[PDB]
């Protein structure tokens with residue numbers, strides 16, 4: 001409808017796949033080469049389904065900060081025959097607050113879904129499903145379970161992936177440029 005949605009759409013059409021694990025279907029953001037991200041609660045194993053194709057997982061790393069606190073991001077390298085468009089230059093370098101963000105989801109249940117979530121707060125610490133978690137972004141929208149993995153963007157930036165909510169607010173894990181230095 002506007003330049004926010006334009007940037008979100010451009011990311012969804014080229015840099016997302018549908019990931020299926022034993023814990024459900026997730027939006028999954030491809031970042032560069034065969035490297036994607038997913039919430040750690042997806043519990044990635046040795047094999048994952050990518051757009052309904054059986055795919056070997058070459059590596060998977062559940063990120064934690066240097067206090068040894070959960071970040072709720074898993075970086076996955078996929079045994080896929082095709083590379084993602086490199087979007088690392090759209091990643092923020094530092095923790096920040098944002099205006100006017102969009103949360104975008106693409107699954108079987110919610111195809112081509114875009115939500116203007118508005119102002120995003122650097123919330124920091126969250127007890128997420130009982131797990132102390134750092135680098136959480138917060139937005140005032142009543143997100144559901146099916147949004148997990150959803151991409152959070154502003155115009156020109158890919159800032160986070162949706163990892164949970166409390167019925168009134170939604171929560172995303174930060175993406176930082178430093179997570180994807182090769």
Ligand SMILES: NS(=O)(=O)c1ccccc1OC(F)F
Pocket residue numbers: 115142143144146147
């Ligand atoms: N965003 S959501 O997942 O809660 C959802 C799903 C289907 C229809 C409407 C809807 O939004 C609700 F907030 F309006």
